[PDB]
Amino acid sequence: VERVYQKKTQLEHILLRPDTYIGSVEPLTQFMWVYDEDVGMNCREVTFVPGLYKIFDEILVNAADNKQRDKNMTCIKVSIDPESNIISIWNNGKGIPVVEHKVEKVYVPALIFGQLLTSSNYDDDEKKVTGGRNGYGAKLCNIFSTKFTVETACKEYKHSFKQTWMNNMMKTSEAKIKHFDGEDYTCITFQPDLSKFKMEKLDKDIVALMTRRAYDLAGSCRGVKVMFNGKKLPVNGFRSYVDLYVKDKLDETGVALKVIHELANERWDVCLTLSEKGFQQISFVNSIATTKGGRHVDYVVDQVVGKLIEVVKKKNVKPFQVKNHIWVFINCLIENPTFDSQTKENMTLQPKSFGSKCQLSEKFFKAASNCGIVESILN
Amino acid sequence: VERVYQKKTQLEHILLRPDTYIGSVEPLTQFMWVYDEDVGMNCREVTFVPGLYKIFDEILVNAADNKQRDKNMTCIKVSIDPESNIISIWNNGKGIPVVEHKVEKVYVPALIFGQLLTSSNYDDDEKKVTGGRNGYGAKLCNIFSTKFTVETACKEYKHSFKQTWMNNMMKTSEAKIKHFDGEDYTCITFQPDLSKFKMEKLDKDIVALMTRRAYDLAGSCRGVKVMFNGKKLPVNGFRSYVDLYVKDKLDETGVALKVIHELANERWDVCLTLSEKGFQQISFVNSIATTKGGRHVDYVVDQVVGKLIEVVKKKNVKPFQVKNHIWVFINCLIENPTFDSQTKENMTLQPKSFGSKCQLSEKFFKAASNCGIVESILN
Ligand SMILES: Nc1ncnc2c1ncn2[C@@H]1O[C@H](COP(=O)(O)OP(=O)(O)NP(=O)(O)O)[C@@H](O)[C@H]1O
Ligand SMILES: Nc1ncnc2c1ncn2[C@@H]1O[C@H](COP(=O)(O)OP(=O)(O)NP(=O)(O)O)[C@@H](O)[C@H]1O
Ligand SMILES: [Mg+2]
Ligand SMILES: [Mg+2]
C-alpha cells in the first residue's frame, strides 16, 4: 500500500518527471537549423538533449524579457565555455530589487531564483508581451545545474547581490550584498548538470543550437544587441535574421528564392518565400522560439493561403497543397500568450485575444503571388 | 515589490495557469472526428474547450489503466447527462484499497483523488503500459468540477468507500465506509465547473467528442467492453474501430479505400490506407489519444515511407511527398512513455526505449504497395 501509492514533493516530481518541465532528458536526432563554427547557419542532422537546450533557453528568454521591464536595455551577452562547462547570460537595463520581500522574508533574487512558482508575470491585468508566464524557468535551470550563480545590481536599491546555488538547487549560502552606484545588470552563470542528460561535455551539436538561439534573439528582440563569446552578432532586426536562411539560396529550378516582407505594425513582422520541402515555419512569440508553431502561424498562413487560392482559381487546389509550398517567418508580440507546455513550443492563444492584428496588405498578397508559390501549384 | 514579485501555491497555480495542466480553457474551432447522434462517426468543424474535453479524458484513461492493475477487468461504463451536468465513468476489476495509508494517515482514495502529486505510477522500475505517469489527472478533474464523487469497492479490504468533493476540490466531508463482500468497481461521478470554461451547458459538440473518445477506448483497450449511456459500443478490437473511419469510403477516383492491417505483436496494431488530404495519423499509446503523434507514429511511418520510396524508384520522390499520401492508424503499448505536457498529445520517448518493436512484414509492405499510395506518387 505505502510503496504502491506514493506522494511526491514538487521538487522530487521535477527530477522524477523532467519531460513536462524541460522536455525529453534523452537524446534526439533530427534535421534542424544550427549555427556551426565552420558553415554558420545551416540545416543538418543534429543529436542533442532537449532538456539541456531548454534550461539554456529559459535564461535567454528571461534576459529578452528584461527589455519589457526596462526599454532602455541595449545588450545581452552570451558566453559558452565547453572546457569549463560554464554558460553565462548577462543583460543591462534595470536589475532586480536587492531588498527583503516583506511577505516571503527573503531577498527578492533568492525568492525568484531559489523557490518554485515565483514571478513578476502572475498579474494578467498588465497585458505584458514577456515570454515569462509560469514562474518556473529560472528554478528549472537551477535544479538542472551543479552550480547556479545570480548576480544583479540595482542602482535604485543602491546594492549588488550575488548568490550561488549548487547540487540541483539543494545547497546555497548567504548572498554577498554590496554598495552599488553604477550601471544596472543581471548575470546568470551556470554549469549544467550533464549527468542529468547522460552527457560528458557540451559537444558541437548542443553548442551550435545554443549559438543559433543567440542569433534568433538578435533577430527577435527589437533594439537589443547580442554578443556571443565576446563578439557582436551581425544581425540588426528580423529581416537581416531571415536573410541568414534565404539570401544565398536557389529553388531547384536554379532561380533565387523571392522573399516577401511586411512589417504590418510594431508587433507583427512577416517574411514569406517558396518551400520545396513541404510547409516550413520559423516563428517567435515574445522572443520564444515556437518550433511547433501555434495560432499565430495559422493566423498569418491562413490569410496567405486564402489569397493564393483566389489567384490560382483565376488562372486555372486545396489549402494543404498551397501550405505545402510556403516557407513563412514570423516575429510577433502577443499579450499574455498561452502554451500547452512549460517548453512553449506551441502557442495556443486564439487570435481574438492577441491584443493586436496582422491584416497583411494587398501589396503583400500581390508580391506573394509572384514569389513562385502560384507557379508550383499550377505546374 | 510585494505586488510585482509573487509566489503561488500549487493549487493557485493550476487555476491561474490551467493551460500547462489541462490545455486551453478558451474555445477552439477546427475540423475533427466526432461521434454525432445523427451521423455517428464523421469529420466536421467543431467548437469546444480543450480543458473540458481533457478532465473527461483523465478519468477515462484512469479506467483503461485499471485493466493493467487487474487483467480480469471486462467493462467501462460512460454516462453523460447534459441536463443534470453529470458525467460518470464506472469500471470493474479490482477497486482501490479502502484503508488508511500508514505514511500519509488518510484513506488511500482520499490521498490519490484529493492531494496533488499522488500515483501508483511513480516507480519506473515496474515498466508499466498504463497511460498514467504524473499523479495529476484525477485531481485536475476534481479542481475543474463543482462536484466530484469517488466510489470504490475493494473485496480484499472488505469495504466500500464514497467521498464527495465540491467547489474546485476546496470542500469535502467524511468518507462513507461500509462492509463490502461483492464484485469490485470504481465509479467517478463529476459535474464539470462550466464557468471555468465560459460554457452554459455540455452542448452537442463537446458531447460528440466525449462520445468518440468512448469509441476510441473500445478500439484501444484490448479485452474491455465499453457502454455509453447504457448501450454497448459495437466495436470489438482496433480493426473494427478503424472501419468506422474507412470502411464506407472512396478515394476521389471513386475506388474504395484499400485498408492494410498488421498485428505485428500484442503491443503493435497498424492499419494503413491512402490519404488525399495530406498526412493523417490516428494513434493511441496505452489508450491515450496521441492527437499530435510522436515517436511511435514516426517509427511506423518511416518504415512504410522507406519501402514505398524503393517501389516507386523501380517504376520511375522525397519522404514528405510519400507521407503526404499516408493515412496511418496505430494502437500501441509503450513502457513508461514520456510526453512534453500533462495533456499527452505528443509522445516523445525514443523507439529504443519502447520495450518492444514493430518490424512490419514484407507481406505488409507488399500490400502497402497496392493500396493506391504508389499510384498517386507516380501520377
Ligand atoms: N535577467 C533578468 N532580469 C530581471 N529579472 C529577471 C531576470 N531573469 C529572471 N528575472 C525575474 O525572475 C522571475 C523568475 O524567472 P522565471 O523563473 O524564469 O519565471 P518567469 O520568467 O516569470 N516565467 P516562466 O519562465 O514561464 O516559467 C521573473 O518573473 C523575473 O521577475
Ligand atoms: N478507475 C481507477 N481504478 C483504480 N485506481 C484508480 C482509478 N483512477 C485512478 N486510480 C488511482 O489513482 C491514482 C491517481 O490518478 P491520477 O491523478 O490520474 O494519476 P495517474 O493516473 O497515476 N497519472 P496522470 O494521470 O499522468 O496524472 C492512479 O495512480 C491510480 O492508482
Ligand atoms: Mg522565465
Ligand atoms: Mg491518470
Residue numbers in the entry:
A (entry chain A), B (entry chain A): 46 to 361, 367 to 429
What's in the article?
The final TOP2B:AMPPNP model contains residues 46–429 and was refined to a Rwork factor of 19.2% and an Rfree of 23.2%. The adenine ring of AMPPNP is held in place through direct hydrogen bonding with the carbonyl of N136, and stabilization of the ribose sugar is achieved via hydrogen bonding to the hydroxyl group of S165. Hydrogen bonds are made to the α and β phosphate groups of AMPPNP by the side chains of residues N107 and K184, and S164 and N166 respectively. The side chains of Q392 and K394 from the QTK loop of the transducer domain hold the γ phosphate firmly in place, with the switch lysine, K394, forming a salt bridge that is believed to stabilize the transition state of the hydrolysis reaction. The catalytic Mg2+ ion is coordinated by a conserved asparagine residue (N107), all three phosphates of AMPPNP, and two water molecules, one of which becomes activated by the catalytic glutamate residue (E103). Our data show that the ATPase domain of human TOP2B in complex with AMPPNP is in the restrained conformation with the nucleotide-binding site sequestered from solvent.
A heart-shaped dimer is formed with a central cavity that is 31 Å high and 23 Å wide, the dimensions of which cannot easily accommodate a DNA duplex.
